[PDB]
Coordinates of C-alpha atoms and ligand atoms in Angstrom, one line a residue:
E1 CA 0.0 0.0 0.0
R2 CA 0.7 3.7 -0.1
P3 CA 3.4 5.1 2.4
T4 CA 3.0 8.6 4.0
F5 CA 4.2 11.5 1.8
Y6 CA 5.7 14.7 3.2
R7 CA 6.2 18.0 1.3
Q8 CA 9.3 20.2 0.9
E9 CA 10.4 23.1 -1.3
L10 CA 13.7 22.4 -2.8
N11 CA 14.3 23.3 -6.5
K12 CA 11.6 26.1 -6.6
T13 CA 9.0 23.3 -6.7
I14 CA 7.5 21.4 -3.8
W15 CA 8.8 17.8 -3.6
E16 CA 6.2 15.3 -2.3
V17 CA 8.2 12.1 -1.6
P18 CA 7.6 9.2 0.7
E19 CA 8.9 9.4 4.3
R20 CA 11.5 6.9 3.9
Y21 CA 13.6 9.4 1.8
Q22 CA 15.3 11.9 4.2
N23 CA 17.9 14.6 4.0
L24 CA 17.0 15.8 0.5
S25 CA 19.7 18.1 -0.9
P26 CA 19.8 19.4 -4.5
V27 CA 22.7 18.2 -6.6
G28 CA 21.8 19.7 -10.1
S29 CA 20.0 18.8 -13.3
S30 CA 16.0 18.4 -11.4
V31 CA 17.7 15.9 -9.1
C32 CA 18.3 15.7 -5.3
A33 CA 20.5 13.5 -3.1
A34 CA 18.6 11.7 -0.3
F35 CA 19.1 9.1 2.3
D36 CA 17.0 5.9 1.9
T37 CA 16.3 4.9 5.5
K38 CA 14.5 1.8 4.1
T39 CA 17.7 0.5 2.5
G40 CA 20.6 2.5 4.0
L41 CA 21.6 3.7 0.6
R42 CA 22.4 7.2 -0.7
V43 CA 20.0 7.8 -3.5
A44 CA 19.4 10.2 -6.5
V45 CA 15.8 11.2 -6.8
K46 CA 14.7 12.9 -10.0
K47 CA 11.5 14.9 -10.3
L48 CA 10.3 15.5 -13.9
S49 CA 9.3 19.0 -14.9
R50 CA 5.8 19.2 -16.4
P51 CA 5.6 15.6 -17.6
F52 CA 2.3 16.0 -19.4
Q53 CA 2.2 19.6 -20.5
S54 CA 2.3 18.5 -24.2
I55 CA 2.1 15.3 -26.3
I56 CA 5.9 15.5 -26.7
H57 CA 6.5 15.8 -22.9
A58 CA 4.0 13.0 -22.1
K59 CA 5.6 10.7 -24.7
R60 CA 9.2 11.6 -23.4
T61 CA 8.0 10.9 -19.9
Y62 CA 6.7 7.5 -20.9
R63 CA 9.9 6.9 -23.0
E64 CA 12.2 7.7 -20.0
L65 CA 10.2 5.5 -17.6
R66 CA 10.1 2.6 -20.1
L67 CA 13.9 2.8 -20.7
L68 CA 14.8 2.8 -17.0
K69 CA 12.4 0.0 -16.1
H70 CA 13.9 -2.3 -18.7
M71 CA 17.6 -1.7 -17.9
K72 CA 19.1 -4.1 -15.5
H73 CA 22.9 -4.2 -15.7
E74 CA 25.9 -3.2 -13.5
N75 CA 27.1 -0.6 -16.0
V76 CA 23.7 1.0 -16.6
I77 CA 21.7 3.2 -14.4
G78 CA 19.0 1.2 -12.8
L79 CA 15.7 2.1 -11.2
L80 CA 15.5 1.6 -7.4
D81 CA 12.1 3.1 -7.2
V82 CA 9.5 5.2 -8.9
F83 CA 6.6 6.9 -7.2
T84 CA 3.8 9.5 -7.4
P85 CA 1.9 11.0 -4.4
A86 CA -1.3 10.7 -6.5
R87 CA -3.8 8.0 -5.5
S88 CA -5.7 7.8 -8.9
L89 CA -5.0 8.4 -12.5
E90 CA -7.3 11.4 -12.2
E91 CA -4.8 13.1 -9.7
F92 CA -1.7 11.9 -11.6
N93 CA 0.6 14.7 -12.5
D94 CA 4.1 14.2 -11.0
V95 CA 6.7 11.4 -11.6
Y96 CA 9.7 10.8 -9.4
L97 CA 12.5 8.3 -10.3
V98 CA 15.0 6.9 -7.8
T99 CA 18.5 5.4 -8.5
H100 CA 21.9 5.2 -6.8
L101 CA 23.5 8.5 -6.0
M102 CA 26.9 8.4 -8.0
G103 CA 30.1 9.9 -6.7
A104 CA 31.5 11.6 -9.8
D105 CA 31.1 11.9 -13.5
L106 CA 34.0 11.1 -15.8
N107 CA 34.7 14.8 -16.4
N108 CA 35.7 15.2 -12.7
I109 CA 38.1 12.2 -12.7
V110 CA 39.9 13.3 -16.0
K111 CA 40.6 16.8 -14.7
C112 CA 42.9 18.0 -17.5
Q113 CA 45.5 15.4 -16.5
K114 CA 46.2 11.9 -18.0
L115 CA 45.2 8.6 -16.5
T116 CA 47.2 5.3 -16.4
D117 CA 46.6 2.7 -19.2
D118 CA 45.2 0.1 -16.7
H119 CA 42.6 2.7 -15.6
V120 CA 41.6 3.5 -19.1
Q121 CA 41.2 -0.2 -19.8
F122 CA 38.8 -0.7 -16.9
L123 CA 36.7 2.4 -17.8
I124 CA 36.4 1.8 -21.5
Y125 CA 35.7 -1.9 -20.8
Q126 CA 32.8 -0.8 -18.6
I127 CA 31.3 1.6 -21.1
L128 CA 31.5 -1.1 -23.8
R129 CA 30.0 -3.7 -21.6
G130 CA 27.2 -1.3 -20.8
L131 CA 26.8 -0.3 -24.5
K132 CA 26.6 -4.0 -25.7
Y133 CA 23.6 -4.7 -23.3
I134 CA 21.9 -1.4 -24.4
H135 CA 22.5 -2.1 -28.1
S136 CA 21.3 -5.8 -27.8
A137 CA 17.9 -4.3 -27.0
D138 CA 18.1 -2.0 -30.1
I139 CA 18.5 1.1 -27.8
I140 CA 21.0 3.7 -28.9
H141 CA 22.3 6.3 -26.3
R142 CA 22.8 8.9 -29.1
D143 CA 24.5 11.4 -26.6
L144 CA 27.4 9.6 -24.9
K145 CA 29.8 12.0 -23.1
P146 CA 31.9 12.3 -20.0
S147 CA 29.1 14.0 -17.9
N148 CA 26.9 11.0 -18.8
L149 CA 29.3 8.6 -17.3
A150 CA 29.1 8.2 -13.6
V151 CA 31.6 6.4 -11.3
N152 CA 31.9 5.3 -7.7
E153 CA 35.1 5.2 -5.6
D154 CA 36.3 1.8 -6.8
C155 CA 35.9 3.2 -10.3
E156 CA 32.8 1.2 -11.0
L157 CA 30.9 2.9 -13.8
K158 CA 27.2 3.5 -14.8
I159 CA 25.8 5.0 -18.0
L160 CA 23.1 7.6 -17.7
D161 CA 20.7 9.5 -20.0
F162 CA 20.5 6.8 -22.8
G163 CA 17.8 6.8 -25.5
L164 CA 16.5 10.3 -24.6
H165 CA 19.4 19.0 -26.9
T166 CA 18.1 22.2 -28.4
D167 CA 19.6 24.3 -31.3
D168 CA 21.8 26.8 -29.2
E169 CA 23.2 24.5 -26.6
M170 CA 24.7 22.5 -29.4
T171 CA 26.3 25.7 -30.7
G172 CA 29.9 27.0 -30.4
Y173 CA 32.7 25.8 -28.2
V174 CA 30.7 23.3 -26.1
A175 CA 31.3 19.8 -24.7
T176 CA 27.8 19.0 -25.7
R177 CA 28.8 18.5 -29.4
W178 CA 32.4 17.3 -29.2
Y179 CA 31.5 13.5 -28.8
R180 CA 29.0 13.4 -31.6
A181 CA 29.4 11.2 -34.7
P182 CA 29.7 13.4 -37.7
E183 CA 26.7 11.7 -39.4
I184 CA 24.4 12.8 -36.6
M185 CA 26.1 16.1 -35.9
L186 CA 25.5 17.1 -39.6
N187 CA 22.3 15.0 -40.2
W188 CA 23.9 13.0 -43.0
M189 CA 21.7 9.9 -42.9
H190 CA 19.4 7.6 -41.0
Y191 CA 22.0 6.7 -38.2
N192 CA 22.8 3.3 -36.6
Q193 CA 24.0 2.1 -33.2
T194 CA 27.6 2.9 -34.0
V195 CA 27.1 6.6 -33.3
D196 CA 27.8 5.5 -29.7
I197 CA 31.1 3.8 -30.6
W198 CA 32.3 7.0 -32.2
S199 CA 31.6 8.7 -28.8
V200 CA 33.5 6.0 -26.9
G201 CA 36.5 6.6 -29.3
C202 CA 36.2 10.4 -28.5
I203 CA 36.1 9.6 -24.7
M204 CA 39.0 7.0 -24.8
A205 CA 41.2 9.4 -26.7
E206 CA 40.5 12.1 -24.1
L207 CA 41.3 9.6 -21.3
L208 CA 44.6 8.7 -22.8
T209 CA 45.8 12.2 -23.6
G210 CA 43.9 14.2 -20.9
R211 CA 42.7 16.4 -23.8
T212 CA 39.5 16.8 -25.9
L213 CA 39.9 14.9 -29.2
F214 CA 37.8 17.1 -31.4
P215 CA 37.2 20.5 -29.5
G216 CA 35.4 22.3 -32.3
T217 CA 34.6 26.1 -32.0
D218 CA 31.5 25.2 -34.0
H219 CA 29.9 22.5 -36.3
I220 CA 32.1 23.2 -39.3
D221 CA 35.3 23.7 -37.4
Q222 CA 34.6 20.3 -35.6
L223 CA 34.2 18.6 -38.9
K224 CA 37.5 19.9 -40.1
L225 CA 39.3 18.7 -37.0
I226 CA 37.6 15.2 -37.6
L227 CA 38.6 15.0 -41.3
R228 CA 42.1 16.1 -40.6
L229 CA 42.5 13.0 -38.5
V230 CA 40.5 10.3 -40.3
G231 CA 40.7 11.7 -43.8
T232 CA 38.0 13.0 -46.1
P233 CA 35.3 10.5 -47.3
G234 CA 35.6 8.3 -50.4
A235 CA 33.1 7.4 -53.0
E236 CA 31.3 4.6 -51.1
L237 CA 30.5 6.9 -48.1
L238 CA 29.5 9.9 -50.1
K239 CA 26.6 7.8 -51.8
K240 CA 25.2 6.9 -48.3
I241 CA 24.9 10.5 -47.3
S242 CA 21.1 11.2 -48.0
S243 CA 21.0 14.9 -47.7
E244 CA 22.2 16.4 -51.0
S245 CA 23.2 19.8 -49.4
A246 CA 25.5 18.0 -46.9
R247 CA 26.9 15.8 -49.7
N248 CA 27.6 18.8 -51.8
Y249 CA 29.3 20.6 -48.9
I250 CA 31.7 17.7 -48.0
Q251 CA 32.5 17.6 -51.8
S252 CA 33.7 21.2 -51.5
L253 CA 36.4 20.2 -49.0
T254 CA 40.0 19.7 -50.1
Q255 CA 40.8 15.9 -49.9
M256 CA 42.8 14.7 -46.9
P257 CA 44.3 11.3 -46.2
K258 CA 43.9 9.4 -42.8
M259 CA 46.7 10.3 -40.4
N260 CA 49.0 7.9 -38.5
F261 CA 47.3 7.3 -35.1
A262 CA 50.6 6.1 -33.7
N263 CA 52.0 9.6 -34.4
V264 CA 49.0 11.3 -32.9
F265 CA 48.8 9.4 -29.6
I266 CA 52.5 9.2 -29.0
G267 CA 53.6 6.8 -26.2
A268 CA 50.2 5.1 -26.0
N269 CA 49.7 1.3 -25.9
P270 CA 49.7 0.1 -29.6
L271 CA 46.6 -2.0 -28.8
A272 CA 44.8 1.2 -27.7
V273 CA 45.8 2.9 -31.0
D274 CA 44.5 -0.1 -33.0
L275 CA 41.2 0.0 -31.1
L276 CA 41.0 3.8 -31.6
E277 CA 41.5 3.3 -35.4
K278 CA 38.6 0.8 -35.5
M279 CA 36.2 3.1 -33.5
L280 CA 37.1 6.3 -35.2
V281 CA 36.0 5.3 -38.7
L282 CA 33.9 7.8 -40.7
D283 CA 31.7 5.3 -42.5
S284 CA 29.4 4.0 -39.7
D285 CA 28.8 0.6 -41.4
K286 CA 32.6 -0.1 -41.0
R287 CA 32.9 1.1 -37.3
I288 CA 33.6 -1.7 -34.8
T289 CA 30.6 -2.8 -32.5
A290 CA 30.6 -3.0 -28.7
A291 CA 30.5 -6.8 -29.0
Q292 CA 33.5 -6.9 -31.3
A293 CA 35.4 -4.2 -29.4
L294 CA 35.1 -6.2 -26.2
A295 CA 36.8 -9.2 -27.8
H296 CA 39.7 -6.9 -28.9
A297 CA 43.1 -7.7 -27.5
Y298 CA 43.3 -4.3 -25.5
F299 CA 40.9 -5.8 -22.9
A300 CA 42.4 -9.3 -22.5
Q301 CA 42.6 -8.8 -18.7
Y302 CA 38.9 -7.9 -18.3
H303 CA 37.2 -9.7 -21.2
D304 CA 34.9 -12.7 -20.1
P305 CA 32.3 -13.7 -22.8
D306 CA 30.1 -15.4 -20.1
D307 CA 29.9 -12.2 -18.0
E308 CA 28.8 -9.8 -20.7
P309 CA 25.0 -10.2 -20.9
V310 CA 22.5 -9.0 -23.6
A311 CA 19.2 -7.3 -22.8
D312 CA 15.8 -8.9 -22.8
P313 CA 13.7 -7.8 -25.9
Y314 CA 12.7 -4.1 -25.8
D315 CA 9.3 -3.4 -27.4
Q316 CA 9.4 0.2 -28.7
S317 CA 6.4 0.0 -31.0
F318 CA 5.2 3.1 -29.0
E319 CA 7.8 5.3 -30.6
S320 CA 5.8 5.5 -34.0
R321 CA 2.5 5.7 -32.2
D322 CA 0.4 8.9 -32.1
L323 CA -1.6 9.2 -28.8
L324 CA -3.3 12.0 -26.9
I325 CA -1.8 13.5 -23.7
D326 CA -4.3 11.6 -21.6
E327 CA -3.4 8.4 -23.4
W328 CA 0.4 8.9 -22.8
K329 CA -0.5 9.8 -19.1
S330 CA -2.5 6.6 -18.7
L331 CA 0.2 4.3 -20.1
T332 CA 2.8 6.1 -17.8
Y333 CA 0.6 5.5 -14.8
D334 CA 0.3 1.8 -15.5
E335 CA 4.1 1.6 -15.5
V336 CA 4.5 3.5 -12.3
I337 CA 1.8 1.3 -10.6
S338 CA 3.3 -2.0 -11.7
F339 CA 6.9 -1.4 -10.9
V340 CA 8.6 -3.8 -8.7
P341 CA 11.7 -2.7 -6.7
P342 CA 14.8 -4.8 -7.1
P343 CA 16.2 -7.0 -4.2
Ligands
LIG1 C1 27.8 12.4 -11.0 C2 26.8 12.9 -9.9 C3 27.7 13.6 -8.8 S1 27.0 14.5 -7.7 C4 26.6 13.6 -6.4 O1 27.9 15.5 -7.3 O2 25.8 15.1 -8.2 N1 26.1 11.8 -9.3 C5 24.9 11.5 -9.8 N2 24.2 10.3 -9.4 C6 23.0 10.0 -9.9 C7 22.4 10.8 -10.8 C8 21.1 10.5 -11.4 C9 20.5 11.3 -12.3 O3 19.4 11.0 -13.0 C10 18.5 10.1 -12.6 C11 18.2 9.0 -13.5 C12 17.3 8.0 -13.2 C13 16.7 8.0 -11.9 F1 15.9 7.0 -11.6 C14 17.0 9.0 -10.9 C15 17.9 10.0 -11.4 F2 18.1 11.1 -10.5 C16 21.3 12.4 -12.8 O4 20.8 13.2 -13.6 N3 22.5 12.8 -12.2 C17 23.2 13.9 -12.7 C18 23.1 11.9 -11.3 N4 24.3 12.3 -10.6

């Protein structure tokens, strides 16, 4: 049955959460840290802003809830709890999500400086293990980056924000665009799962060197940095770019050959370099997958084929379905009500 709910103003809104959650303190984007007296765990509790203000919001709310309920994996943010203080569907208008409070994002550990090769192995291994599970369910993260990768004190890693930016926040000299596969940055085509492997490659590079790999001052500048490294596209890839405007623009660019990665990442483990060359491939059909990357020699100390699970089938037929706000709300309510907390 329904626990007692208390109220509290925190992020300029009043948070009505069950009594078990105490010592709520804001931590950013809205999310609060709290202590779960019921489990003894420190938790992150997320309140969604106007979940059913439009069709899009209602759908996105349902999407998020659906994604987090499905995901059960060490390297993927999992749901400890979801609640609403509403007793009926008629009163339903607030959704709260609960997970582990994580110590630090990847940005905070990197801190301009380099990391040891063993550290980089463990961290990239965990992202890839997470990604393989996510991808096995035909879910793409689409926005992998250091601030989306959260870590504990033993350097155990979870992926956040999978499967879920405006026009201006993607503009200029911003970490929001630096990890984006050029196909999706420039809308070249219907994009596949390997957009995420491009992001891993960006992240891995930064971990080895302590520096951003493609720190573009804008979309076009970032593209130039990318083609400098990996070379301009050949005939086969140009055909695959569906946007004619985009195809025509690349075809304006002076041809450049792929660089020597050994000479770019001086001093780095040659297995790292090799792996990097397979991730940072312009044509997305030819990029290495998370499954294949996990069997690469670079991870020989961590790789265990029987300890790298795939996800249960994910039904996302809802994605191409047009419902009314009320209908999205009703679906979301059923998912809240039916949730079963993990052991
Ligand atoms: C990396 C931060 C460091 S700290 C303690 O300084 O804030 N730790 C952390 N730990 C957990 C989260 C969880 C989130 O979103 C959630 C995602 C799912 C959920 F069920 C609940 C959530 F709060 C979410 O956006 N962020 C930014 C989180 N951040």
